[PDB]
Amino acid sequence: GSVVIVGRIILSSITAYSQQTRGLLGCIITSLTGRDKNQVEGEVQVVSTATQSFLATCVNGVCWTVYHGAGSKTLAGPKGPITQMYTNVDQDLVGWQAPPGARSLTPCTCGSSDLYLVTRHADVIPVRRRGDSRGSLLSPRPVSYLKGSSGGPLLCPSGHAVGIFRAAVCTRGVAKAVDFVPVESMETTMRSPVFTDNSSPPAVPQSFQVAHLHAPTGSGKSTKVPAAYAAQGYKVLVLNPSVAATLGFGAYMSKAHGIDPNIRTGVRTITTGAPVTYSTYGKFLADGGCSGGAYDIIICDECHSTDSTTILGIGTVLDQAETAGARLVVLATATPPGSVTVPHPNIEEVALSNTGEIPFYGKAIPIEAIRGGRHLIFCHSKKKCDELAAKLSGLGINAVAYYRGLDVSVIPTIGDVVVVATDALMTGYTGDFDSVIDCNTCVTQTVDFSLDPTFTIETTTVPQDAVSRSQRRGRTGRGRRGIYRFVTPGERPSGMFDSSVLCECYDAGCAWYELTPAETSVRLRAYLNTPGLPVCQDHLEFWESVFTGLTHIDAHFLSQTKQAGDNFPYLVAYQATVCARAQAPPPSWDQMWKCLIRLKPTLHGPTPLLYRLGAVQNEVTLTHPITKYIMACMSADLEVVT
Amino acid sequence: GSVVIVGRIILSGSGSITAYSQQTRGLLGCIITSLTGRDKNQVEGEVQVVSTATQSFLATCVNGVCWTVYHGAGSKTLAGPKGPITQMYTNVDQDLVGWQAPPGARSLTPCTCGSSDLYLVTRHADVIPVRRRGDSRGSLLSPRPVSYLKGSSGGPLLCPSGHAVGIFRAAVCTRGVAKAVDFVPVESMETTMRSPVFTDNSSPPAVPQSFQVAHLHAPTGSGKSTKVPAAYAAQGYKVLVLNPSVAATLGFGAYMSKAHGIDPNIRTGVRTITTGAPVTYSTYGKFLADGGCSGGAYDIIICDECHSTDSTTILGIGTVLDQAETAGARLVVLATATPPGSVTVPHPNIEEVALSNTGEIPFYGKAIPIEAIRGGRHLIFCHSKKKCDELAAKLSGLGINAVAYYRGLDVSVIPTIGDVVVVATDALMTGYTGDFDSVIDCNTCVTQTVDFSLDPTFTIETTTVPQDAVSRSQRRGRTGRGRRGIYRFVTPGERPSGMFDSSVLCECYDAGCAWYELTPAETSVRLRAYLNTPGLPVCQDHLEFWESVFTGLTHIDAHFLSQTKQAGDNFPYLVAYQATVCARAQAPPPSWDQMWKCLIRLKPTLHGPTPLLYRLGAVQNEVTLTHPITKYIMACMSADLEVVT
Numbered sequence A: 001g002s003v004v005i006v007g008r009i010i011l012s013s014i015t016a017y018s019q020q021t022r023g024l025l026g027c028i029i030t031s032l033t034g035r036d037k038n039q040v041e042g043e044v045q046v047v048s049t050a051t052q053s054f055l056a057t058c059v060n061g062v063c064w065t066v067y068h069g070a071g072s073k074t075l076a077g078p079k080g081p082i083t084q085m086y087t088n089v090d091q092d093l094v095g096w097q098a099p100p101g102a103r104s105l106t107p108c109t110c111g112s113s114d115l116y117l118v119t120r121h122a123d124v125i126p127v128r129r130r131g132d133s134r135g136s137l138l139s140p141r142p143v144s145y146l147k148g149s150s151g152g153p154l155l156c157p158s159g160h161a162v163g164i165f166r167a168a169v170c171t172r173g174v175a176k177a178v179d180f181v182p183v184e185s186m187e188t189t190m191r192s193p194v195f196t197d198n199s200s201p202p203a204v205p206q207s208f209q210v211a212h213l214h215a216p217t218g219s220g221k222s223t224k225v226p227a228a229y230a231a232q233g234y235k236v237l238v239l240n241p242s243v244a245a246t247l248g249f250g251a252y253m254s255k256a257h258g259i260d261p262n263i264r265t266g267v268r269t270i271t272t273g274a275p276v277t278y279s280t281y282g283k284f285l286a287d288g289g290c291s292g293g294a295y296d297i298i299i300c301d302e303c304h305s306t307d308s309t310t311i312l313g314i315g316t317v318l319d320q321a322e323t324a325g326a327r328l329v330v331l332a333t334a335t336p337p338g339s340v341t342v343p344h345p346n347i348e349e350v351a352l353s354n355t356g357e358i359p360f361y362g363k364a365i366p367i368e369a370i371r372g373g374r375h376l377i378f379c380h381s382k383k384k385c386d387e388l389a390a391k392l393s394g395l396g397i398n399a400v401a402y403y404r405g406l407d408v409s410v411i412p413t414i415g416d417v418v419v420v421a422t423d424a425l426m427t428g429y430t431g432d433f434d435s436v437i438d439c440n441t442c443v444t445q446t447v448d449f450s451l452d453p454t455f456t457i458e459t460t461t462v463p464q465d466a467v468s469r470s471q472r473r474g475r476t477g478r479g480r481r482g483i484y485r486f487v488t489p490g491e492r493p494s495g496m497f498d499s500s501v502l503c504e505c506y507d508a509g510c511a512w513y514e515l516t517p518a519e520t521s522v523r524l525r526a527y528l529n530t531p532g533l534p535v536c537q538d539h540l541e542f543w544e545s546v547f548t549g550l551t552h553i554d555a556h557f558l559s560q561t562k563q564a565g566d567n568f569p570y571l572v573a574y575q576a577t578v579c580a581r582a583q584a585p586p587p588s589w590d591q592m593w594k595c596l597i598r599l600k601p602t603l604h605g606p607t608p609l610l611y612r613l614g615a616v617q618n619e620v621t622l623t624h625p626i627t628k629y630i631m632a633c634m635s636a637d638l639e640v641v642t
Numbered sequence B: 001g002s003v004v005i006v007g008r009i010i011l012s013g014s015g016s017i018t019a020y021s022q023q024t025r026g027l028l029g030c031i032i033t034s035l036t037g038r039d040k041n042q043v044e045g046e047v048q049v050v051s052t053a054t055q056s057f058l059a060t061c062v063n064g065v066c067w068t069v070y071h072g073a074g075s076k077t078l079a080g081p082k083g084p085i086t087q088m089y090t091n092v093d094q095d096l097v098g099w100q101a102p103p104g105a106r107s108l109t110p111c112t113c114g115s116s117d118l119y120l121v122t123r124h125a126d127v128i129p130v131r132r133r134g135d136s137r138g139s140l141l142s143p144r145p146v147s148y149l150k151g152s153s154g155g156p157l158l159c160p161s162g163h164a165v166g167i168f169r170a171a172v173c174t175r176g177v178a179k180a181v182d183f184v185p186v187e188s189m190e191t192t193m194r195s196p197v198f199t200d201n202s203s204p205p206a207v208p209q210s211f212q213v214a215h216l217h218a219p220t221g222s223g224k225s226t227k228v229p230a231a232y233a234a235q236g237y238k239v240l241v242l243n244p245s246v247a248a249t250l251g252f253g254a255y256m257s258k259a260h261g262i263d264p265n266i267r268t269g270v271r272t273i274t275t276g277a278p279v280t281y282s283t284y285g286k287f288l289a290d291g292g293c294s295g296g297a298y299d300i301i302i303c304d305e306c307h308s309t310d311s312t313t314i315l316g317i318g319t320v321l322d323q324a325e326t327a328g329a330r331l332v333v334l335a336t337a338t339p340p341g342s343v344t345v346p347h348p349n350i351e352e353v354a355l356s357n358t359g360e361i362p363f364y365g366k367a368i369p370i371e372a373i374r375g376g377r378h379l380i381f382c383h384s385k386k387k388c389d390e391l392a393a394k395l396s397g398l399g400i401n402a403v404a405y406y407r408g409l410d411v412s413v414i415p416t417i418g419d420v421v422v423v424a425t426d427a428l429m430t431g432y433t434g435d436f437d438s439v440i441d442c443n444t445c446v447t448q449t450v451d452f453s454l455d456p457t458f459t460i461e462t463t464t465v466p467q468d469a470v471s472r473s474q475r476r477g478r479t480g481r482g483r484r485g486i487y488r489f490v491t492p493g494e495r496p497s498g499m500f501d502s503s504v505l506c507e508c509y510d511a512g513c514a515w516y517e518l519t520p521a522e523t524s525v526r527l528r529a530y531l532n533t534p535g536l537p538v539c540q541d542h543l544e545f546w547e548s549v550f551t552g553l554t555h556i557d558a559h560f561l562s563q564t565k566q567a568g569d570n571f572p573y574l575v576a577y578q579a580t581v582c583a584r585a586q587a588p589p590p591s592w593d594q595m596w597k598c599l600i601r602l603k604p605t606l607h608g609p610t611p612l613l614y615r616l617g618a619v620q621n622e623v624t625l626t627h628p629i630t631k632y633i634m635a636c637m638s639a640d641l642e643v644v645t
Ligand SMILES: CC[C@@H]([NH3+])c1ccc(Cl)c(Oc2ccccc2)c1F
Pocket: A067, A068, A089, A090, A091, A092, A496, A497, A498, A535, A536, A537, A538, A641
């Protein structure tokens, strides 16, 4: 899909009105063709994808807008799809060369503080500047009235551009201020090189530096380059999210480059005194971060991964490495933020159709496509893994399921097999496959600041992004031919993660890694402040304030929720602690609250709700001091995107 | 736009009930197929996954007919092999519509036996045990979040033999958790088929010998409010004609006096005459303020414009329905041009023309050419007061006799006189009786919708929405009366007619308490008479919920209530009640929006967090939730609440 211009906002002194130029059918066709003959006029376009509508402002002969709406998408144009000229994920800014007929606003350098925000409804909202990227609405408005206006201009009185709107600053679901991308960030972006080669590892610098390495999985980014550095005489640490990949490196390196390295995972540890160590991020955090002077170079592998341990591990390194004596951090991934999937030479891509004995996410699989050989099928849930595995087994296909919870020994490693699995596979098992068949959806978690009474953490099924598609497809075609089959050809933009991931980081810090919320904030802040990494909204003070209130948890419930191994074991266990001390029942008797089951006969009355982590069946009271505390925390300034 | 089959749910041949889905169309194919109404793909399976541009749900063929929900499909056609298929059955009251099953389509068959173990099929092909507890209700064996059931409406409930018991249309929820499911029984599908496919309501009924409720679906200028009661009067019957508009009511009476001979009784706030005639013209508000039906006074009651869903009208009609038989009436007539289920058909006096981007006057993303309005009598419907004032301004500056009209302004500001462009809200339709050479329609209106948002209680939010058939049909109606007329529009779209939000029920209790001295219990009886009567606009049964809420709100401040009644805005009771609770705690209102002006003079003495009862708009001030009324309302949210799927 391409981005499509579906209207415009005309400026004149400052007033505006808007014009629509496409309906739905036109938008969709134009988005599939990427061919737009419609004449472009104005400095503000109203634009749309198949999922959202927003604005775009031309400045300096460039049409600009937000990464969180456009991603890395092309813009439909007279002669076809227009590739983006600039892609600055870190500033939430992208830009296409202005098409013929378009006008540009000029930047503002008189430096006025009385500003005017233009919306998708063509209203003109006065704004008092507060900083480089903040302004306060003179009249607070409900957040919903700014929705769809991301990308609109912030104008000084003389009509020039100060920047583009990117998000509202809410206080309890009401917008008192606005975040914008300032015109100086636009000019900085324009002077940066479009091509920047991150395929070569850099040489060790004289003083501390953070460098990026974008290279295919099996370039030797985690094998050959660590070996090269060690030859030059350095001590190198390779961090990786998979236990099975970390272990695998030990045997590979001892054969191929004659180095028997240190290995550090939770299930196994080996110290050989070698100058190269391979660790998981999680085991790295358990060992208490950087040891003063132990390493010259730290290589954070798969730094595209947006799981809490990886983010927390990488932010720890970014906070500590210099102080502990390192000269070099290398952030390594094949799929960096802003990447899209491109054709792979070694992999042949074939859409699924409706003909097939095996129904699969609305489409079908031919039994002839998986009868012999080794094939991997990605499903979104374990329930689905289980039922597809059973089907296949009943047809006499040798088929097995894999997901979080199961021992990887369900393998088999040699022989005909179909593996039906979730993304747990990515970290659990390292082999590749004659084909990958991919449902193209993922389970993820999303926070909702629902003030009912506090927040909600919802589990939802959503389309895959560009990293998911590439990483799943990349389980076939490794040094040998391969096939990838898909239910749908789409792709969400890569490199963003939800605020629940942040909440997860504080939770794990408390549950697993003996980190105070203040400590956790320091480490995440280094992650945020370092560019070229995945991006999120800055909700650190909020989440810090919330967990900071969660005191004197019951150690047995914590142990039990960690043991059962599910999400947010600290939030779950803290709610259970409050329920037990208040002598009151849990929100439900879902498996989530089984730590309270022996107390079931004696718990009665309304649940002192702290927050929603699933369905709430029981009645709730709001009188508990901890609830009162978390409600007060919601008055904090919260960026939400528009 | 037609409904389009975009996929299907395939049920298992034997053993235990299981299913899987197949998708036969993408988005592009869906949109094209909806605009042409032509679907050459063949129809397999008995459970279809259907879609409009706006939403998607399920449809289930039983005994020859592809059934689904009115709240999903409205009166729309089904895309077919030889073009659009019109609906064969349209039952607004049961939330059930039906197209004749296309070629070779397969139909489930009814639950002949009579088990009480049931299985619901969802759009995800999940099969979910249900326990029948009534004709149209069964409980989920394992309660679920209601989000999981959205888009499954129209799906079947099966008995273990795989026979259809009905089709899902809504969940019963407790605080966001579906505990049970509502369906349209299969025998309500056969009650639908053992009626005639066409019913006639174009002629006023004969007076029956015993109490009967009849419907009159006939256009304005058929004389529904002048000629027909005149006719009944001529046969010696006493007749009451009720209407939502003061100006319409006065006009009919004045027309009757000079044309049909009679000098009728008139009853409104502003003018009331007793002449002893056997025809009486009243508004719904005055009828209610008079305490409803007085014994033996009328044989016939015409409830005119019975399509209207303002609180007064609903409350008024509810009253007549509850009180007429016992007051000795023989006949209640529910009269409208635009009954529930109706569609905007072409009018031979009216030339319909799409606005373009060509024009000097920007209008809702399109354009009005000055030529089209420079000379004559013209009407422009805008959704908000604000826009009307912007558009009157922008028009007159360019040399026009432009004027606005919306609630608050006195009519007569609309002259006549000749050349004019009136820019107005829908308030035009209760304030002014005249018509125009052309009508220009923004195709949108403001409405109010309730969210059970548990933050802490409920929210009532003003939103802007696409117009429905009634809206479009009534807005067009102000041109092409006798002579030729023109209708210009921004959008061809049209939402289904005859549904109203739960917030409208809220307004009925509020008006009950604020204007007409009705206890919540007394209002429930009246509303119950309206729901139970068929062929009237329909809503979700939340009567107990809303009764329970207003029953708690006692000892309101008489002064604030008088000011919110006078200012004329919605929910004067809830607004005044929140203010009563604020003033008594010396706390500020949730904001300093105009809604809270009754409290402006006390601003100096009002400090601290607002004890919030519910949300009627943005809340800027901190909130406490400790107030006994807040808690009382919080407990009411435990009620069983039907919500759609
Ligand atoms: C410029 C501020 C930075 N924190 C930032 C950078 C890029 C993007 Cl897409 C940002 O917004 C989101 C919004 C939702 C999810 C992730 C990120 C974002 F908030």
